[PDB]
Amino acid sequence: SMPATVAELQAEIAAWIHPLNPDRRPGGTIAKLLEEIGELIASDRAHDPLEVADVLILALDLATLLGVDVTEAIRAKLAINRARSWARADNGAMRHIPGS
Amino acid sequence: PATVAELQAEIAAWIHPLNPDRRPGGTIAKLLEEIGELIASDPLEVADVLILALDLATLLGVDVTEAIRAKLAINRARSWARADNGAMRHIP
Amino acid sequence: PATVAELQAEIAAWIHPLNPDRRPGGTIAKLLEEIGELIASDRDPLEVADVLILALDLATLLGVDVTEAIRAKLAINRARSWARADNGAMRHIP
Amino acid sequence: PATVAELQAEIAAWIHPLNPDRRPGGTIAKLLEEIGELIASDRDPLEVADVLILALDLATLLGVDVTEAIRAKLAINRARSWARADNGAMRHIPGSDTP
Ligand SMILES: Nc1nc2c(ncn2[C@H]2C[C@H](O)[C@@H](COP(=O)(O)OP(=O)(O)O)O2)c(=O)[nH]1
Ligand SMILES: Nc1nc2c(ncn2[C@H]2C[C@H](O)[C@@H](COP(=O)(O)OP(=O)(O)O)O2)c(=O)[nH]1
Ligand SMILES: Nc1nc2c(ncn2[C@H]2C[C@H](O)[C@@H](COP(=O)(O)OP(=O)(O)O)O2)c(=O)[nH]1
Ligand SMILES: Nc1nc2c(ncn2[C@H]2C[C@H](O)[C@@H](COP(=O)(O)OP(=O)(O)O)O2)c(=O)[nH]1
Ligand SMILES: [Mn+2]
Ligand SMILES: [Mn+2]
Ligand SMILES: [Mn+2]
Ligand SMILES: [Mn+2]
Ligand SMILES: [Mn+2]
Ligand SMILES: [Mn+2]
Ligand SMILES: [Mn+2]
Ligand SMILES: [Mn+2]
Ligand SMILES: [Mn+2]
Ligand SMILES: [Mn+2]
Ligand SMILES: [Mn+2]
Ligand SMILES: [Mn+2]
């Protein structure tokens, strides 16, 4: 499929990792995710799709381990984000402004 | 279930008007904040991490399906050892 | 001059009244936020300060003698062999 | 207890022969690896040591006087007001600087 559904990508990731690390857990997955984000930061390569892939392989598989429906969770939080008020943070991302 | 590209389009359509000069560096900064929240904590928190990780791919122009499949093909040909943190490291 | 233990004491004296039940998990979470800010910065001693304030306080919360722990791990590191990793740091050879 | 500058000097004297052209980017990358190890630990001082070795060497590479920088930021933090965040740490209240 092209583009694949996020669940199909999770399944392809899991088909690779499950024979090798069937009882992997969220904590070790987050630890590896931080390693791979580090590699992306340090990457001198103007384009590094394989380092982005490492980050996404772990983030999508984290969702699998936590039983999270990626489509439902992302759309539910985007709906929350649309209803929120926002201000820019110094790092260039945003932070929401509390209502009640 | 949505395609990864459709979720990228929905994320970008929300953040782009609010943050028109968003960059990979600030996206990575925020991603690290949200991973911290997950450590300290949960589907909506996982959502925060994925919203930022997928938008980083958008900003870097990475075809997610193609890149993940390419790296999984590399990972299949590698041999692996279990790391102390419970994840793996490939054997050089 | 002030030692790492004295900086830990100064940090603890500031944060403890504000966050009397602070714990390693939230401190690691805040440390990740501040490393992110350092990454995104376009400059930055005060962002480095934010990282070190949290990392030194993490050692305090975990009961770690910073001088002795650093010197003990450096001694382990001297006994290892090292390869250059793609990110520009090193990884020891098993 | 050693001064932070002395610990930085010992760290630098160890790593510089092995990695003389090391940079902040790779040091941050490794720092994140070692923080991850602390998160996943089912235990420890040597893991805390890995984090601090890299965070202090980062300060060296960026030319930061650690004692001066930490004291300057603590002074700023004392003048701020603070709210507790959901992760258990604090975030300063915007606009609350005591003048
Ligand atoms: N892609 C993208 N998402 C962003 C950016 N700034 C904030 N966000 C989103 C990511 C998360 O879904 C959400 C986090 O909101 P925030 O105020 O920390 O609140 P919280 O939801 O973590 O409690 O905001 C940004 O610059 N880019
Ligand atoms: N989902 C998942 N992926 C894992 C785990 N351990 C390793 N991986 C994958 C994520 C990346 O695609 C890859 C990283 O390999 P590694 O030996 O650091 O090498 P590198 O490819 O970063 O150079 O391995 C793990 O425990 N879970
Ligand atoms: N300052 C500095 N320290 C470095 C660098 N590359 C590796 N190190 C040190 C930091 C830690 O004390 C140690 C981490 O070793 P590693 O092979 O991951 O093994 P481990 O000790 O985490 O099991 O190596 C580097 O580039 N700079
Ligand atoms: N040790 C410790 N320090 C904390 C905690 N919560 C916040 N801080 C400190 C660390 C940094 O010096 C500072 C971060 O402040 P913040 O409101 O993100 O603002 P900023 O200084 O990053 O702009 O606050 C906390 O729970 N523990
Ligand atoms: Mn990688
Ligand atoms: Mn790696
Ligand atoms: Mn790499
Ligand atoms: Mn969040
Ligand atoms: Mn947040
Ligand atoms: Mn949260
Ligand atoms: Mn901050
Ligand atoms: Mn900042
Ligand atoms: Mn800061
Ligand atoms: Mn370590
Ligand atoms: Mn390590
Ligand atoms: Mn370890």
Numbering used by the authors:
A (entry chain C): 0 to 99
B (entry chain D): 2 to 42, 47 to 97
C (entry chain B): 2 to 44, 47 to 97
D (entry chain A): 2 to 44, 47 to 102
What did the paper state?
Cyanophage S-2L is known to profoundly alter the biophysical properties of its DNA by replacing all adenines (A) with 2-aminoadenines (Z), which still pair with thymines but with a triple hydrogen bond. It was recently demonstrated that a homologue of adenylosuccinate synthetase (PurZ) and a dATP triphosphohydrolase (DatZ) are two important pieces of the metabolism of 2-aminoadenine, participating in the synthesis of ZTGC-DNA. We now propose a complete 2-aminoadenine metabolic pathway for cyanophage S-2L and related Siphoviridae and Podoviridae phages. The post-infection composition of cellular dNTP pool is heavily altered: dATP is eliminated and replaced by dZTP, which is created in turn from dGTP.
Purified MazZ of cyanophage S-2L is capable of removing two terminal phosphates from a nucleoside triphosphate. Its preferential substrates, dGTP and GTP, are rapidly dephosphorylated to dGMP and GMP, respectively. We obtained crystals of MazZ and solved its structure, bound to the dephosphorylation product of dGTP and catalytic Mn2+ ions, at 1.43 Å resolution. Contrary to other members of the all-α NTP-PPase superfamily, each MazZ protein chain has two additional β-strands at its C-terminus. Together, they form a homotetramer with a typical MazG-HisE fold: to our knowledge, it is the first time that the fold is recognized as identical for all MazG, MazG-like and HisE enzymes, despite the number of determined structures. The whole MazZ tetramer constitutes the asymmetric unit. The dGDP intermediate observed in crystallo is almost completely buried inside the enzyme, except for the solvent-exposed β-phosphate next to which we found three catalytic Mn2+ ions. The closest residue to guanine’s O6 is N20, through its amide nitrogen at 3.2 Å; the 2-amino group is only 3.0 Å away from the carboxyl group of D60. Altogether, the specificity of MazZ emerges from the cavity volume matching guanine’s shape and its charge compatibility. Ion A is coordinated by residues E34, E35 and E38; ion B by E50 and D53; and ion C by E38 and E50.
